[PDB]
Amino acid sequence: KAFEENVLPFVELNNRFHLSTPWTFHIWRDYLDNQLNSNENFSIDELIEGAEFSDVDLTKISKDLFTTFWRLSLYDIHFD
């Protein structure tokens, strides 16, 4: 719980400052992971957690498949 108080939320890390989209997702992927395997009521909370995107337009890229690119890691694509 100490993580979200120090680091800036990326609804304003992408809007106020403008560090680009691989850097904004890199800080935040492991934090959305542990909330989505916590509970089903916890699952619906972080997928709506978002704001304006300066670098990408979700007008011709399908936001269902676009956002799950950056949402997923290689923990769950490959398995041996």
Next chain:
Amino acid sequence: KEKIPPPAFDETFKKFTFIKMGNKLINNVWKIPTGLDKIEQEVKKPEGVY
């Protein structure tokens, strides 16, 4: 055959100076401003430069 006056001991401590640190080299470091608002101006828009 002299009259010796009583000695006056000094009761006054010395003053400090305007440099709140020791050197002028250390004190020039601790005079430049820090904070999130100065970084925000140069990162104004990447698309606006693009």
